[PDB]
Structure formats: structure tokens, C-alpha cells
């Protein structure tokens, strides 16, 4: 907290001088805010263990200037695929198609791509690779599927806590409760019956006091961290059913209607990195994935959030309000907004967004350090909803 | 001739007079026709309309200057020396000072190699000692600019205000920065200038936007330019996070000036205020407009 | 000497050497790429 | 693998059948040495003798299949074939009422 | 142009050399008493230099030593007067004096290197912030405790929500191998924290000053690196019982090779040792802090953190 | 001239030199007009921007040398004896070496023939016994070489460390190569040099990168260069399997230089570690820099 | 203006006369984008024709009576000439939802 | 078959309307006496004021209709618009158990 | 004059200056125009 | 006299006159034929 006297005394008492300080300093903050934005990514390839333990192991690593050329997409909700080109000379694409015929390696591989120091991180599993001729040129074109795709890959039978060929009772199974919770809940029974149904489920899996501590999850690749059934702040609850659907078909339309979001983050112990706040989360290895449900948009907040706003006085808050049934929402707005600022905005170095007090809009104008491609529009279609069939 | 003199101070510091009083001194002339040298490279942009066209507005592209150098002197190695010199002040990565000089100031455009140079004749260039350079450089801010007005206002008082006279003598808009200490709160202008660019130009005659409250040692500086993000604190904080969604729409118009008002509120200390106006011209030379 | 040869001929864009059959490719890999991960296994 | 057989030796459909197995390599370094072995197909015989473009009859193979590999519009093809098969089949199980 | 005006012109200069402009430029009539003066403004405006020529019938020479033209810089803005008797100054030449001889950027140019820094820390925000990086126990080991129950400023230790163990890396290195630390600390309970100096990038040697305290273990130790978590004791311990708000300096002289501890403002080394077997130089400039404690309650732990180069 | 040496070392190891003092002893001189021979092609990427296009960054391009040659004798027998050893000296797939002698030292580059070259006159050469040779040649590696240089560190201790003495006197970034004797933990610097390419130019000034332990015969280079695999052991054993994703990402950049540390521990015969730096120039001949 | 301002119904049609209303294409907003070619921007327009309105009139098996307490029989089923019985199934669900 | 009209007397609407029968011909050789009779289908009436390419108001005919000579993409439409109908249609026919 | 210069490189038709991508977003609006109204809405 | 002209622009391919409706024409054949035949009857 260098104050403007002290900052002049020490200039002593030449206010340009002083100027000329804040302004070097303000330089180097924004320098670092481009060097960060600049900076190359992280590709890093990873196998299974060839002996069939845990723990991903260390093939090798892309350079970017090495790459052909390379595509990653981040989805809402939904399963992307990243490309990543390379030439057949290179050693991670020889070692790629060696792969196939290589009796001694596990036909599994994992990409994990780390944007600023892997803050951003894209994680996939292999799908497939080509051998590609241009001109008589081959290189390697490599498709991986981003983490998303464990869950149509994971779904939820009737009675996930029994065996599934003996008696799988009800018809349908039913779960309701917080959003977050719920969903998280889902993932989390379908991968403890995945992993074996080894133990006994307590009533409530993210009640951390519930399970033993003695218990070994460090054979688990996929975690879900969530809140407790009484804990969740999810203003809304959600019912989730399931005929042996897949588990991101069950939890797409509750994830639209809540506005939430699945994050995956692959832990990467390798690099230091710990994770925290689900069962045996002490003891996960190297490049385990973990599932963690939140609130991005904070729309269904009691405080609201922003839905709209002008140039000239920025966002305009406004909350929900439900009609008779609360199958109807609206929006009210907050006339007199008096929302405290999170206390991450007020931290040195701290550039997120908070979903309680969004802030980034950005302008296109004359002079517009963007290309904006296309904004559509389209109103509403039908009034009336039908739903139904036997009851 | 003596009514120009132009420059070039390299990425290493180097000074080179290509043309004007003492020009190859240092051994390196400028040879004729240089090319988006003078004018902003600008493209119109037209919709179909009922009588052929209609105009959709300008859009000022970077500048792509192909000029040649003549490296001379008496003796072949001399000549080396001056031909890797003059290698040496330009670079890629980094931008070197082309600074043009006339009656009417000193200008300067900040150039960086767009490719290779392309040297010597088709002999070897020990043989003549006076070889031409072919350079393309290129200027991705095309707009020839002098040094800003800067102005300080420093205050002692918990709640004050002032003027600060501004005036767009240029041809082209500029965009006004600030630095503003803290802790306060600040109200810094955002007028229109009579501008219709989102249709609200005598709507906004008088805007005023609040910056958010500052709290200690979290200076800050405004900075209303495009290029840039318009808060940055010099302790990191984000500044802007807290600023919802506000921001500085609005260049200072050419031909347009006023005594543009500044508040500082809620300030125990009293602190200081600094407005840098940019002086940016479209042409290297041109005669003050009114 | 750049403007008015092949030194705008290259602002011009794709009015000399382009091929249609690599465009097509390309355009049908991003196509792929953006709708093979949501489509059924079925 | 897709194969173009300009003016190899190879003869289809007399050397090498629909549902034969047959062996292919690709001039890529790390796998010079293996043979991909996988049972022809497809096989297209294809000319055309337009003044413009002239191409004499050819034949291009390939061999193995892949889902994953397959353009989208096949493979929607083939997912509606197969969904509307199913459709038909869940209908006519229908139990009336 | 119908009134008479400058002519710009350029002026060379050369360190070591004497400035002269020859009779046989400046020519013209001039009537006895004429005077010619040449100034030399910056780009503010300010005189940098005033000189006077020597005026005769039919010529101007102009000659100064080298020590009075030494501090006009290239790009300094030159303009030269005659004044006829009885009559206003009129200025013949203007421009711009450039230098011609050898150029030393390296002289004029500090680089980041050769540069002594200076950084601090203070909790105060109660968040870790960007410029300490967890190290032992991985990210997420730090932490901050309010000790809000005494009148104390929040501090700095280890995650006891997950670990009794963790060490934090100053993000940037320093720039000697000689180091100036202060630490202001608290002694909430019995624990370990460990003073870090000439660490490496993971901190796997570095030399250190540990304060124990305990039931009975109030001592202070030099201990060397075997990784951010584990440490070897060099000498004899001395024993210090620390109180809430302590101040210690630890000084790590390189010429000397000698790491030593002093307490608040003592003029003798609380703890001395030398000759400690571990790498300096380039590569090993690194500092940090260590806690360990037995219980998962903060131990001693720093309120305040500073370092400098150099001692 | 005697300023300018250009010789060409073919892929059968023949030496020819095309121009300066004594060229033409073979009977192949050089013809003028050589391009894209000098300076290193670098194309540069631009990003749209709000006042044109904003500088997004650099990539070298690989040279493609179009020169000519001229294979000269009194009789036509002899004439086609040195025009089939001047075909001889140059291969496709193998490269032949380009040097260049001038006061700055000598300056190497390996090119090998793009196309087919293009021999004679329009009638048949053995009338004329002195004929040109259009050569196309390419250059993979774009940038002129000098010997790289190399250092030697033997050690009989278990635990050790030196200081290498490294400098980059080029005016490109170059990649060190390490090569390293087993058993023994080896820590080898991999120091930014201030490069920010990571948005690590600060944490990293002194970092070091350590390798995984080395079992007996497990001799391992260690190359930081982007087309080479960063670890590779002599003997077919996966080293970089047991590396937990870590590498070597910096250069060393132009201008810097210093006493990089490396440290061997755990080796129970001593060890041994050399250091290959090379130097790499954008230009046949250029002053020293700095 | 019209997806943002408050004083307006969101639904818009548009009406196409050729031959001075001989021929007409009449049709509801289905969306517009806003796009940009070459920094110029133009705004398209999609709208659909009225026969989509068909698309969102049902038939529920008793038009005549509330939908969610009893629909009987299982099925709707009308028989008639092709036009009359057409005409009358799209009149009783105009009936129905209106 | 389609047909595009670009200054005939033909007035689409006016003379002919959509579902109205009409003949054409095509000048292919063992063809031409044959009038081909089908009932309008459809009919686009498209324009472009474009400075680069400008197309007066011109009218397009398609008289009769084929899923064989349908394009690919209207063809996938057209099956999942009547898959999700039939999908729709046993999803409702369901009995509960 | 016109014969035998870009008077009848515009008889040619797209051989000079033509682009691929606004040719091959035509395409595809047309599809759209064509299948977009006959998609089901679920 | 053919290396350099036209004879060269033919080894460049469809740099020159080719117009992009044959081609999207020629792909969409090449896909109809592909698809058609497995696509259902429904």
C-alpha cells in the first residue's frame, strides 16, 4: 500500500516523477497480462501403466512450434473432440503409431493440454489417428475425446447397489434433492458400482464423516467432489431417473433448466498438484480425473444476477420470480442494487470471474480488438407444453 | 532538402539521419519512392443499397512501407560494419523510432521488419562498398504521432474537483489515459463530443462515469485506447471486476476541446490526478486544424 | 513493386493457386470434429 | 486403409476378393516393418472419360472398417438405418391395450 | 517567405574530442560588437548548455573544451544567435546535435540481472496471494490464521485443514548470493519454521535457520536442504524462546560464507555457522519458508516477511 | 574479391570454391544473382487489430538458394569430367556443405538440391566446353553455423558440481545439447534467459531440471532443440518414461550467457557430462553483437 | 430493437404480395442474425411460412373435453370425405386451443 | 422436374398454382414429343441486389416430387422428422407396468 | 478491347478473383433454407 | 516455351478457370451415392 505522499517522497516531491513510477508499474502488470495471454501451451501425452497399476506414466511432450497444427474445444455440458496434427518424423507420432502393434503398451492414451501454466486444462482420452498423404507428405492427424465422454460411458441401472443380472428393483431408479448434490450423487453411485460395490453406501456419499478412513479409492479414475445433502446451496432441487440411460442424457436437461456446470480437472500428481474435498482424496494417482458440478451463471441465486445492460451503465441485476406452480419464471429487477463485491476482487492477481458479480463485456465497435462473427436472436415458439402418455 | 529530416533510432538505440541535414553520416542515405509512407492506409466499407452502394463506415489498416537504403563508404570493411549496424537496428519482436522532423514538429512511426531484407546487388557487395537494402517494414499502428500533452492535478482536499483543458488538434480521434491514486473515488468524463457512433451523440454530451472505489495503495490507470484493458491497479487487483461492466466509450473527437471535468469524493488523504492526451496524426507533416 | 503484382495478388486472396478439393476436406474434418463427438455409438 | 491401385499388378477381384484378407503397408517412419492385415472391403472400379478431366478405369480398395473413421454423413446413414429398423421392430412389439 | 527565417542544420559531437564549428561556415559581414551565442535546450526546453562564439569581421568561430559540451546528448535541440549592435537577436541555425563516435549501451543500460531486489509480504489479506508457491505437500498446502483472539496480525503456515507440514517458494529469485531476511513472527504453540536462503528451484538444498519451540525446545538450529520437507541440523542449537512480534534477521554473507541469525536489534549473531556444504551462485538464489508442526494447530509462524539482496 | 570466400564441400567430401582468392581452380566459378543467400527468411504473423492488424509473431522459413554455377575448360573432354564431378558434389537426400569465409570468420550452411538442376546452353555444351548450371538448392536448417562449441566435465566424485561457461554471441536462440554418462542423478540448468515464452521469464531464471536416476550403461543425450527427442538412452531404455512430465523449454536467447550450474549426485564411478552449444547466424557475415 | 424493447410483442410477420396480392407468402419471424461480411454488416431474416403453425396444432384423442382429467378414447378417430374430414380435424383443435 | 423460368410469358401463382397439374418437355433425343404431366410442387421466387452478383426476381418450378432424386440432406431430414413422430407415437402407445 | 481481357475473363466465370468460403456458406444456407423448417424440434 | 506458361498453370492445377458449382455438385454425387443406397425407405 505505497500511498501518493510516500510514492512523492520518495520521488522526492516531483510529481512526474511519480507518475512516471505508477505508470512503469502499471506497465509491468499489463506486460505480465500479455506474456500470460501469450504464452505457448503445454501438450503432454501420458499412457496406463504397462504393468496394469494405477497411476498414468509420462510418454512424452508435443512443442507447439513442433505441432502441424491443433484444435481444442471447451464445452458447456457437452463432449468435444481435440485435433492435433503432427509430422510422422516426429517422436511422439512415431511412438503413436508404434502403439498399435506394441504388445509391451496399453492401447490408452491421454492428451492434456495446459493453457497459463495449466490453469486451463484440456484432457482427452484417445480416439483415433490417421495417416494422412498431402502431396505425397504424411503426417499424423490425432483425435482425442475430451473428458467429458466417461459419462455417456457411465449409466445408471435401476439398482445400482445390487448386482444388475439378478434384480435390478424398481422398474426405474429415482433420486431427488439438491441440484448439485443430486447429480454429483448420480455420478458418484454409478462410479462406485463401476469400481465394484466393494463397501457398504452410507446414506449420504459426500458426508465425508460417513466413510471409513481406512478405505483405499486410489484404484478409482474417476472422483466427484460435491457438498453434503444438507449442505448444498442449491436453491433448486431436481428429480433424476434412470432405465440404464447414460448418466449425461439422465443429467443434461437438469443441467439446462439449473444452468450448471460440469467441471472436470485431471490431478496430475506428477506436477504437484493435490485435490481435495471428496472421499479418498488424499490418495488419488497421477492423471485420475475428478467431476465437480457448480454454478457458473448463479442465475437461480436468492441475490440474483445479471441478465442485461447498456454501455453506458453497465449490467443490470435482476433476480427470478416464480409464477403459480413455478413451472414460470420471470425476471424482476433489483432497483436499488446494493450487492457487496466478492472478496476475490478485492485479492492481488486475481482475474476470474465470480458468478455473483459478473464483469467482462466486451464491446464491438470501430476500433474493436475482437471479430464478432454473428449474434442471432429468435423468440419463443410454443405456448402450451404436453407431457404425458400412461400415467 | 532542409524542409525534412528523417530518422531512424534503432531497436538498439542507434541513431541514422536517411534524409534532411546531415544525411549519411553515418553512412546509410535513403533512396526514392517510399511507399505508405505519408497517408493511414484506409478502406471504406459499403452495403447494397436502392442507388448502388451506401456508405458503412472506415476502417484504418497497418501500415506496409517498402523503402531502399544505400550502405556506402570508402573502404570495404568500414562498409561491412556499416551494413551489420544497420542490420542490427531493426529487428522482428521489437519496434524501431522512424522519426520525420519538419516545420510543423517532429512525428514518429514505430516500424518492425515485416520479412528478411533484401541486400547488396547481384555481385558480391565487397566490390562496391555501396549497396542498396531493400526494407519492408510495417507499421501496426499506422498513425504518425508526437509526444502528449500530459497534465496534473494534485489535491489535499477529502472531496475536490477541476478542469483540464483538452483539445484535439490532430486529424484523427485520440484516446485519453489516466492515472489517479489512491484511495477515492473518481468521476472522470467520457464525453460524446457531439460523436455518433452508438447513436446517443448529444445524449452523451456530458458523460460521466464512476470509477470504483479504490482502496489503499491500489493506483490505477485508465487507459481508454482499445488496444488495452482500461483499468489496471499497479498492485495486481482487479480493478475492473468491480467496475460492472462500465467503460470509456468515447475518444476525444478532432477539432473538438473543453475543460473536462474530474471529482474526487471519499479521499482521507487527498490524492492525484494525471491526464495523457495523445497528439496522433494520419500524415507526417501537416498544419494545425481548427 | 508490391502493389499491383503477386505482392496483392495475396490481398486479393485465393484468385490464384487455391485448391477446391483440399477446402472441401478441411471443411468436412471441422463438420467431423464438431459433431462426431455427439453422435450415437449405436 | 484406403488404397488407389493406379497401375499396380494387383488385379481386383481376380488376385484379391470382397472379404479376402489381405496385407498393407504405409511409408511411415515406425511402421515400415508391419503389414496391417485386414479383409478387402470395398473395392470401386472408376473412370471417367470426360475432354476436361480423363481418368482411365481404376480401381481404389478398402480395406478393414471403421466407425470411428467413417465420414458423417455415413455414419448417420447407417445410425438411421439402423434406428429406423429398430422403430420398426419396437412397434411391432407393442403390446395393444 | 517574406520574412527571413533559420535554416535547420545538425551539430555532430564526440566524447573526448573538442567541439569546434570553423570560421570559414559561419560567414557574412559583421560590424565590431556583433555577438554570436549558441544554446543547447533538452526536450523540455531546459538550457543544457550556453556558449558564445568568437566574432569577426567576416567570420564566427566557435570552440569549446570537451568537459563543456560532455553532458549535451544526442538528440539535444541546438540553436544559434547573431546579435548585431544595437540591434535584437536573430537566429541563423537550428536543429538537432547528433553524436558521432563509438556507443556504449551497456553502460547506459541496467540489465534485470545485475539488479538488487527487494520483497515483501504481509498476510494481511488473509490470502496466499500469487507470489508464494507451495512446495513439499503440493498446491493448496498454505494457508492463513487470523489469531484473532490476541491483538496479532493474521500469519502464514500450512494447511492444517490437510497437512502439519508444508513449505512456500518465494516466486522470484534474487539476484546475489549474499541475502537479507526479516522476519517478524508469532509463537502460537509448539511447532518448527524453517527460514530458507540459496535454495534451488525446487528447493532441494538450500541452507536455513529453524526455530523450535515446545515444552522444553526453545532453541534455534542451522539446518541444510534434503528436499522443501526435510532438513539436516549443522552445529550446536542456541537456545532462544520466542515471544508474539519477534523480529529476526537472517544474513547469509557469501564472501564470508557465513549464514547468521540475529534477534530484534542485537548487533551480535543470535546463531553463526560457515562453511556449509551446499551450491551457490546462479541457479540457487531461491528463498522460502518451512513449517512443521507435531499437532494441527499453527506453531511459529511469520506475520511479516521481507528479503533483499545483499547484506 | 579477397574480402568474400564461398566454398562448397559436396556430399562426397570434394571442395570447390566458387568465388573469392582462388576461385575457378576446378573449373566451376559462380555467377552473380544468388537469392535468399544473405539474410534468414522470416515470415511474420499478423492478428486483426483495432487500428489494423496487431502483431501476432514470427516463423522462420527454410531457404531455397536459386544460384548458378559455370563449369569452364579448354577442352571438351576435360569440361565434361568437371561438370559430372560438379553433378557428383551434390545429392537429394544427403547435404552438402555451404561455407563462407569473411573477416567475421567462417560461416557454414548444408543445402542439398530442391530440383533437378538445370545444365547447358540451348545447343550442345561440348561445343562451348564452358556452361551454366542452374542450382536450386535448399536449406532444411535456415540459419548460417559456425562449429559448435563443446565442453567436457569429468568427475571421480560421487556428489559434484560445476559451472559451464555459455554465451549465445548469435542473433538467434540456440538449443543446447547434453550428453551424460551412467550410473548418477544428473541436474542439468534450464534457465529462461528472461524468455517469457512460458509466462515463466522471472520463476525460471534459475531453474533446473533434474533427471531421472540413471542405471548402470544407461548413457543418455539429452538434447533441448524441438526436432530431437529431449532423452534419449543409448541403450533402447525408455529414461523419459521415468521424467513425470518435465523438459527442458528454453533456449539459450541471444546476447546472454553465464556459469550454468550442473550437479551430479549418487554416482558411484564418477561421471562424465559434455556440453554442445552451437552458433547459429541469420547472416554469412555480420559484426559482433551485444 | 425488438428482442430488447419492453413495449413489444416479440412475434412479427411478414407478408410477400406478388401481382398486387394475387400471390402472397405470408409468414412469422423465425430468427434474424446479424453477420458480417468484409467489416460490413447486414441483418438476415428467416422467417417460416404459415403452414408450420400445423406443426404445433395436436390432436389429442378427446379435442372436445380437458385434456389432463380423461382423454378416451385411446385414439382420435374421423372418418369422412378427404376434404371435410381434413378440414374438421383442423378445425375442432382450433377449437380446442382457442 | 425443375425448371427455372427467367423471362417466359409463364406467370407462376398467376397461370399455374402450387398443386396444379401442368405439362413440360425436355429436348432429349426420344423424348421430345413426350409431355411429362405433373402437379406443381413447388415454386421459390428468389432475388439478388448484391453489386458483385445481381439476379433480378426469378422463379423456380419443381413439378412432381421423388424421394429418389431428393438430396441426401432433405432425405435425413425427412426420415427423422417421421422417426421422431413414430418415436413419439409408441412412446405414447406404451402400457405401464 | 473487351475481347480477350477481363471482359471475357468474366465470361469465364470464377477464375480470377472467387473465394471458397462465402461459396461454400451460400451452399449451406441454402441446405438450411431447404431442411430447417422439415427438422423436428425435439 | 511450355515450362512457364500455361502448360505450367495446368501442372498448378485449377488455379485458372474451374468454377466451384461442378465441384460441390461432383462431392455431394460423390456422397448421394455413398449414402444412398443404406439410407431406409421409411
Given at each position: 500500500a505505497n500511498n501518493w505522499t510516500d510514492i512523492l517522497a520518495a520521488s522526492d516531491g516531483d510529481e512526474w516523477a511519480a507518475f512516471k513510477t505508477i505508470e512503469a508499474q502499471a506497465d509491468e502488470v499489463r506486460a505480465g497480462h500479455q506474456a500470460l495471454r501469450r504464452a505457448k501451451p503445454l501438450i503432454r501425452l501420458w499412457m496406463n501403466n504397462p504393468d496394469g497399476s494405477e497411476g498414468l506414466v509420462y510418454v512424452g511432450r508435443v512443442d507447439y512450434d513442433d505441432?502441424?497444427?491443433?484444435?481444442?474445444?471447451?464445452?458447456?455440458?457437452?463432449?468435444?473432440?481435440?485435433?492435433?496434427?503432427?509430422?510422422?518424423?516426429?517422436?511422439?507420432?512415431?511412438?503413436?503409431?508404434?502403439?498399435?502393434?506394441?504388445?509391451?503398451?496399453?492401447?490408452?492414451?491421454?492428451?492434456?493440454?495446459?493453457?497459463?501454466?495449466?490453469?486451463?486444462?484440456?484432457?482427452?482420452?484417445?480416439?483415433?489417428?490417421?495417416?494422412?498423404?498431402?502431396?505425397?507428405?504424411?503426417?499424423?492427424?490425432?483425435?482425442?475425446?475430451?473428458?467429458?465422454?466417461?459419462?455417456?460411458?457411465?449409466?445408471?441401472?435401476?439398482?445400482?447397489?445390487?448386482?444388475?443380472?439378478?434384480?435390478?428393483?424398481?422398474?426405474?431408479?429415482?433420486?431427488?434433492?439438491?441440484?448439485?448434490?443430486?447429480?454429483?450423487?448420480?455420478?458418484?453411485?454409478?462410479l462406485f458400482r463401476v469400481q465394484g460395490n466393494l463397501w457398504t453406501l452410507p446414506d449420504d456419499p459426500f458426508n465425508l464423516e460417513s466413510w471409513d478412513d481406512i478405505l483405499?479409492?486410489?484404484?478409482?479414475?474417476?472422483?466427484?467432489?460435491?457438498?453434503?445433502?444438507?449442505?448444498?446451496?442449491?436453491?433448486?432441487?431436481?428429480?433424476?431417473?434412470?432405465?440404464?440411460?447414460?448418466?449425461?442424457?439422465?443429467?443434461?436437461?437438469?443441467?439446462?433448466?439449473?444452468?450448471?456446470?460440469?467441471?472436470?480437472?485431471?490431478?496430475?500428481?506428477?506436477?504437484?498438484?493435490?485435490?481435495?474435498?471428496?472421499?479418498?482424496?488424499?490418495?488419488?494417482?497421477?492423471?485420475?480425473?475428478?467431476?465437480?458440478?457448480?454454478?457458473?451463471?448463479?442465475?437461480?441465486?436468492l441475490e440474483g444476477t445479471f441478465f442485461s445492460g447498456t454501455i453506458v451503465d453497465g449490467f443490470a441485476r435482476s433476480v427470478l420470480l416464480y409464477g403459480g406452480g413455478f413451472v414460470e419464471d420471470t425476471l424482476s429487477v433489483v432497483s436499488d442494487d446494493q450487492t457487496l463485491q466478492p472478496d476475490e476482487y478485492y485479492q492481488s492477481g486475481w482475474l476470474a470471474t465470480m458468478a455473483k458479480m459478473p464483469w467482462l463485456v466486451v464491446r464491438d465497435n470501430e476500433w474493436t480488438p475482437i471479430e464478432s462473427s454473428d449474434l442471432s436472436w429468435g423468440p419463443a415458439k410454443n405456448v402450451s407444453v404436453i407431457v404425458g402418455g400412461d400415467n | 532538402?532542409?524542409?525534412?529530416?528523417?530518422?531512424?533510432?534503432?531497436?538498439?538505440?542507434?541513431?541514422?539521419?536517411?534524409?534532411?541535414?546531415?544525411?549519411?553520416?553515418?553512412?546509410?542515405?535513403?533512396?526514392?519512392?517510399?511507399?505508405?509512407?505519408?497517408?493511414?492506409?484506409?478502406?471504406?466499407?459499403?452495403?447494397?443499397?436502392?442507388?448502388?452502394?451506401?456508405?458503412?463506415?472506415?476502417?484504418?489498416?497497418?501500415?506496409?512501407?517498402?523503402?531502399?537504403?544505400?550502405?556506402?563508404?570508402?573502404?570495404?570493411?568500414?562498409?561491412?560494419?556499416?551494413?551489420?549496424?544497420?542490420?542490427?537496428?531493426?529487428?522482428?519482436?521489437?519496434?524501431?523510432?522512424?522519426?520525420?522532423?519538419?516545420?510543423?514538429?517532429?512525428?514518429?512511426?514505430?516500424?518492425?521488419?515485416?520479412?528478411?531484407?533484401?541486400?547488396?546487388?547481384?555481385?558480391?557487395?565487397?566490390?562496391?562498398?555501396?549497396?542498396?537494402?531493400?526494407?519492408?517494414?510495417?507499421?501496426?499502428?499506422?498513425?504518425?504521432?508526437?509526444?502528449?500533452?500530459?497534465?496534473?492535478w494534485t489535491t489535499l482536499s477529502t472531496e475536490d474537483m477541476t478542469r483540464f483543458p483538452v483539445r484535439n488538434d490532430g486529424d484523427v480521434p485520440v484516446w485519453l489515459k489516466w492515472t489517479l491514486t489512491a484511495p477515492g473515488l473518481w468521476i472522470l468524463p467520457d464525453f460524446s463530443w457531439g460523436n455518433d457512433m452508438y447513436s446517443r451523440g448529444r445524449e452523451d454530451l456530458g458523460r460521466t462515469v464512476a470509477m470504483p472505489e479504490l482502496v489503499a495503495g491500489e493506483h490505477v490507470s485508465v487507459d481508454s485506447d482499445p488496444r488495452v484493458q482500461t483499468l489496471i491497479a499497479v498492485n495486481g487487483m482487479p480493478t475492473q471486476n468491480r467496475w460492472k461492466g462500465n467503460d470509456l466509450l468515447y475518444p476525444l473527437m478532432p477539432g473538438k476541446g473543453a475543460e473536462i471535468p474530474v471529482q474526487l469524493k471519499n479521499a482521507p488523504e487527498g490524492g492525484a490526478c494525471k491526464l495523457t492526451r495523445p497528439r496522433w496524426y494520419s500524415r507526417p507533416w501537416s498544419r494545425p486544424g481548427v | 513493386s508490391s502493389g499491383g503484382g503477386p505482392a496483392v495478388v495475396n490481398n486479393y486472396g485465393d484468385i490464384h493457386t487455391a485448391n477446391y478439393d483440399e477446402f472441401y476436406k478441411g471443411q468436412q474434418r471441422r463438420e467431423a470434429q464438431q459433431q462426431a463427438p455427439i453422435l450415437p455409438v449405436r | 486403409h484406403l488404397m488407389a491401385l493406379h497401375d499396380s499388378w494387383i488385379i481386383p477381384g481376380l488376385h484379391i476378393d470382397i472379404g479376402q484378407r489381405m496385407g498393407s503397408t504405409v511409408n511411415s517412419k515406425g511402421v515400415e516393418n508391419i503389414v496391417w492385415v485386414n479383409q478387402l472391403e470395398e473395392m470401386t472400379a472408376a473412370w471417367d472419360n470426360s475432354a476436361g478431366q480423363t481418368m482411365p478405369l481404376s480401381w481404389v480398395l478398402k480395406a478393414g472398417k471403421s466407425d470411428r473413421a467413417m465420414s458423417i454423413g455415413e455414419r448417420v446413414a447407417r445410425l438411421a438405418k439402423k434406428m429406423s429398423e429398430a422403430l420398426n421392430n419396437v412397434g411391432v412389439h407393442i403390446v395393444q391395450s | 517567405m517574406l520574412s527571413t527565417g533559420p535554416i535547420m542544420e545538425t551539430l555532430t559531437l564526440t566524447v573526448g574530442s573538442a567541439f569546434e564549428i570553423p570560421g570559414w561556415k559561419l560567414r557574412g559581414e559583421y560590424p565590431a560588437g556583433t555577438t554570436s551565442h549558441l544554446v543547447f535546450t533538452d526536450?523540455?526546453?531546459?538550457?543544457?548548455?550556453?556558449?558564445?562564439?568568437?566574432?569577426?569581421?567576416?567570420?564566427?568561430?566557435?570552440?569549446?573544451?570537451?568537459?563543456?559540451?560532455?553532458?549535451?546528448?544526442?538528440?539535444?535541440?541546438?540553436?544559434?544567435?547573431?546579435?548585431?549592435?544595437?540591434?535584437?537577436?536573430?537566429?541563423?541555425?537550428?536543429?538537432?546535435?547528433?553524436?558521432?563516435?563509438?556507443?556504449?549501451?551497456?553502460?547506459?543500460?541496467?540489465?534485470?540481472e545485475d539488479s538488487a531486489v527487494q520483497y515483501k509480504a504481509n498476510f494481511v489479506g488473509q490470502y496466499i496471494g500469487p507470489m508464494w508457491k507451495p512446495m513439499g505437500n503440493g498446491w493448496g498446502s498454505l494457508g492463513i490464521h487470523t489469531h484473532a483472539l490476541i491483538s496479532e496480525?493474521?500469519?502464514?503456515?500450512?494447511?492444517?485443514?490437510?497437512?502439519?507440514?508444508?513449505?512456500?517458494?518465494?516466486?522470484?529469485?534474487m539476484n546475489m548470493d549474499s541475502v537479507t531476511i526479516v522476519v517478524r513472527v508469532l509463537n502460537v504453540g509448539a511447532g518448527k519454521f524453517?527460514?530458507?536462503?540459496?535454495?534451488?528451484?525446487?528447493?532441494?538444498?538450500?541452507?536455513?535457520?529453524?526455530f523450535e519451540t515446545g515444552i522444553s525446545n526453545n532453541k534455534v538450529h542451522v539446518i541444510t536442504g534434503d528436499g522443501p520437507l526435510n532438513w539436516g541440523y549443522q552445529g550446536d542449537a542456541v537456545n532462544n524462546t520466542t515471544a508474539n512480534g519477534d523480529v529476526y534477521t537472517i544474513k547469509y554473507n557469501d564472501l564470508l560464507d557465513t549464514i547468521s541469525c540475529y534477534k530484534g536489534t542485537s548487533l551480535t549473531p543470535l546463531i553463526e555457522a560457515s562453511g556449509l556444504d551446499v551450491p551457490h551462485g546462479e541457479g540457487f538464489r531461491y528463498t522460502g519458508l518451512a513449517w512443521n508442526t507435531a499437532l494441527l494447530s499453527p506453531g511459529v509462524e511469520p506475520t511479516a516477511w521481507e528479503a533483499k539482496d545483499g547484506v
Open positions: 505441432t502441424i497444427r491443433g484444435s481444442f474445444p471447451f464445452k458447456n455440458n457437452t463432449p468435444s473432440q481435440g485435433v492435433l496434427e503432427l509430422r510422422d518424423d516426429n517422436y511422439l507420432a512415431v511412438w503413436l503409431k508404434q502403439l498399435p502393434n506394441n504388445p509391451e503398451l496399453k492401447k490408452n492414451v491421454v492428451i492434456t493440454v495446459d493453457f497459463y501454466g495449466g490453469k486451463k486444462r484440456w484432457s482427452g482420452l484417445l480416439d483415433k489417428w490417421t495417416i494422412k498423404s498431402k502431396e505425397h507428405v504424411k503426417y499424423l492427424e490425432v483425435t482425442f475425446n475430451d473428458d467429458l465422454t466417461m459419462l455417456q460411458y457411465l449409466l445408471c441401472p435401476p439398482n445400482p447397489a445390487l448386482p444388475i443380472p439378478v434384480l435390478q428393483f424398481p422398474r426405474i431408479f429415482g433420486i431427488a434433492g439438491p441440484a448439485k448434490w443430486a447429480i454429483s450423487t448420480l455420478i458418484f453411485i454409478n483405499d479409492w486410489s484404484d478409482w479414475q474417476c472422483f466427484v467432489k460435491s457438498n453434503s445433502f444438507l449442505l448444498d446451496d442449491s436453491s433448486v432441487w431436481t428429480f433424476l431417473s434412470s432405465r440404464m440411460n447414460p448418466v449425461d442424457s439422465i443429467i443434461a436437461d437438469a443441467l439446462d433448466d439449473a444452468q450448471l456446470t460440469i467441471t472436470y480437472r485431471r490431478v496430475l500428481t506428477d506436477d504437484g498438484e493435490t485435490a481435495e474435498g471428496f472421499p479418498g482424496a488424499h490418495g488419488i494417482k497421477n492423471g485420475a480425473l475428478v467431476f465437480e458440478i457448480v454454478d457458473n451463471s448463479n442465475a437461480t441465486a | 532538402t532542409d524542409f525534412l529530416k528523417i530518422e531512424l533510432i534503432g531497436r538498439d538505440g542507434s541513431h541514422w539521419v536517411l534524409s534532411g541535414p546531415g544525411m549519411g553520416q553515418q553512412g546509410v542515405t535513403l533512396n526514392p519512392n517510399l511507399q505508405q509512407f505519408y497517408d493511414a492506409p484506409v478502406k471504406t466499407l459499403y452495403v447494397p443499397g436502392p442507388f448502388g452502394e451506401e456508405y458503412a463506415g472506415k476502417r484504418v489498416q497497418r501500415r506496409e512501407i517498402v523503402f531502399s537504403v544505400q550502405a556506402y563508404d570508402e573502404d570495404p570493411d568500414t562498409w561491412s560494419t556499416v551494413d551489420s549496424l544497420w542490420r542490427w537496428a531493426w529487428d522482428y519482436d521489437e519496434e524501431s523510432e522512424l522519426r520525420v522532423s519538419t516545420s510543423d514538429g517532429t512525428r514518429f512511426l514505430k516500424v518492425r521488419l515485416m520479412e528478411e531484407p533484401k541486400p547488396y546487388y547481384e555481385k558480391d557487395p565487397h566490390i562496391t562498398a555501396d549497396n542498396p537494402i531493400v526494407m519492408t517494414v510495417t507499421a501496426t499502428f499506422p498513425y504518425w504521432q508526437d509526444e502528449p500533452e500530459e497534465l496534473i | - | - | 526536450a523540455a526546453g531546459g538550457t543544457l548548455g550556453e556558449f558564445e562564439g568568437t566574432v569577426s569581421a567576416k567570420e564566427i568561430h566557435y570552440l569549446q573544451a570537451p568537459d563543456d559540451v560532455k553532458n549535451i546528448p544526442h538528440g539535444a535541440n541546438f540553436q544559434l544567435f547573431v546579435t548585431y549592435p544595437s540591434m535584437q537577436p536573430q537566429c541563423l541555425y537550428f536543429g538537432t546535435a547528433i553524436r558521432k563516435e563509438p556507443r556504449y549501451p551497456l553502460s547506459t543500460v541496467v540489465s534485470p496480525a493474521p500469519s502464514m503456515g500450512p494447511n492444517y485443514s490437510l497437512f502439519s507440514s508444508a513449505a512456500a517458494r518465494w516466486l522470484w529469485s524453517n527460514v530458507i536462503v540459496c535454495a534451488d528451484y525446487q528447493m532441494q538444498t538450500y541452507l536455513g535457520i529453524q
